[PDB]
From a paper:
Mammals conserve multiple mammalian Atg8-family proteins (mATG8s) consisting of GABARAP (GABA type A receptor-associated protein) and MAP1LC3/LC3 (microtubule associated protein 1 light chain 3) subfamilies that tightly bind to autophagic membranes in a membrane-anchored form. These proteins are crucial for selective autophagy and recruit proteins bearing LC3-interacting region (LIR) motifs. Many mATG8-interacting proteins contain canonical LIR motifs that have a basic hydrophobic LIR motif with a core consensus sequence of (W/F/Y)-X-X-(L/I/V), which binds to the W- and L-sites conserved in mATG8 proteins using the amino acids W/F/Y and L/I/V, respectively. In this study, we identified LIR motifs specific to the membrane-anchored form of each mATG8 and characterized the residues critical for their selective interaction using cell-based assays and structural analyses.
GFP fused to the LIR motif of TP53INP2 (LIR[TP]) bound to all membrane-anchored mATG8 proteins. The crystal structure of the LIR(TP)-mATG8 complex has not been reported previously. We failed to crystallize the LIR(TP) mutants bound to mATG8 proteins but succeeded in crystallizing and determining the structure of the wild-type (WT) LIR(TP)-GABARAP fusion protein at a resolution of 1.75 Å. The conformation of LIR(TP) was unique compared to that of canonical LIRs, where W35 and I38 bound to the W-site and L-site, respectively, in a canonical manner; the region N-terminal to the core LIR sequence (residues 28–33) formed an intramolecular β-sheet with the core LIR sequence (left). An intramolecular but distinct β-sheet was also observed for the RavZ LIR, with the region C-terminal to the core LIR sequence forming a β-sheet with the core LIR sequence. Although the LIR(TP) peptide used for crystallization possesses six acidic residues, only one residue (E29) forms an electrostatic interaction with GABARAP (R67), suggesting that the binding affinity is largely dependent on the core LIR motif. (A, C) Crystal structure of SpHfl1 LIR-GABARAPL2 fusion (A) and LIR(TP)-GABARAP fusion (C), both models of which were prepared by combining GABARAP and GABARAPL2 from one fusion molecule and LIR from another fusion molecule that interacts with each other in the crystal. Meanwhile, the W to T mutation within the core region of LIR(TP), referred to as LIR(TP[T]), which makes this LIR motif atypical, induced selective binding to membrane-anchored LC3C. We noticed that the α2 helix of the LC3 family, whose C terminus contained K32 and F33, was located closer to the LIR-binding pocket than that of GABARAP subfamily proteins (left), a feature that seemed to enable K32 and F33 of LC3C to interact with D33 and I37 of LIR(TP[T]).
Residue numbers in the entry: 1 to 131
Amino acid sequence: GPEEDEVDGWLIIDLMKSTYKEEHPFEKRRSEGEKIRKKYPDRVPVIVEKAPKARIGDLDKKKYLVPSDLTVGQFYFLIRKRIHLRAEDALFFFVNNVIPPTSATMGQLYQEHHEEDFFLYIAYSDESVYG
């Protein structure tokens, strides 16, 4: 459920819409996120999860470390291929419940949308409204 974490004198409220967040306590996630960012300042750590209601393939692995210059379009290609999605079937990414432009880079998305644990969370679905 909704979580509250204190960082730098702020009480951070997180609606916790992520299986990964539910299974990994905030302190552990932020500690790992800090470590990955320090070790690889040029890479973007992404947690990729299927929207619950989406009737398409699930991912076997959620954790991707991608170059900052990888485009959203290239990441679509990778995810689509990994879940064996036919070309006739739609796939949408959501970051903070908004579909990012295919032309955006993963570094841009990280800078605009990374969470208080230093991970970027992307959900995906077969439909353009998240659910």
